[PDB]
């Protein structure tokens, strides 16, 4: 498995671009990640929210904004989407803060 290295700071606003949406109407997005117990998991909807949207906001252009990256958001994220034709993506990014526990 490959994951991009991203050096971050605790309490720093970071913006990430998560591509995957083709030139078609907004489909369902099965957001996932790779962690131990997994605390930062939440399925996102192009027409809905939930207990996660208040933490990470998704821009209409296909980007994730984190007001303050802490230690809970430190891990391997995977912005995956699911088309009704069997189409997804294995995009993985690993964020690492300077102040680790």
């Amino acid at each position: 498995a490959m994951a991009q290295n991203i050096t971050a700071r605790i309490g720093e606003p970071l913006v990430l671009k998560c591509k995957g949406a083709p030139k078609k109407p907004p489909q369902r997005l099965e957001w996932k990640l790779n962690t131990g117990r997994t605390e930062a998991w939440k399925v996102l909807s192009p027409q809905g929210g939930g207990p996660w949207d208040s933490v990470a906001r998704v821009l209409p252009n296909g980007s994730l904004f984190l007001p303050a990256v802490g230690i809970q958001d430190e891990g391997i994220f995977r912005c995956q989407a699911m088309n009704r034709n069997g189409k997804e993506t294995k995009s993985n990014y690993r964020v690492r803060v300077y102040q680790i526990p």
Binding site: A1, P26, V43, S45, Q47, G48, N92
Partner: protein, 94 residues
Amino acid sequence: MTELETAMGMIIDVFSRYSGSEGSTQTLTKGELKVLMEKELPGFLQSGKDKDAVDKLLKDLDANGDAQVDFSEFIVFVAAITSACHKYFEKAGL
């Protein structure tokens, strides 16, 4: 309560917390099912938040043939989603 026990028990609570608004108290109706899908798992629907896929999903889970999702049919849905997620992570390593 053990860890695995808490996980299983939490599923029960979630169910009983949404089922009981109308129709029954131990069965999920179409209305309550929509609320559940628009709160617990909002994003698995291609219709976003519309009742389009909801009606179809209800008829997909309804195996008893009464248009009411029982825990017996609901647990299958939860299990399936979890299984697919883990299996994906298995291949995510390679």
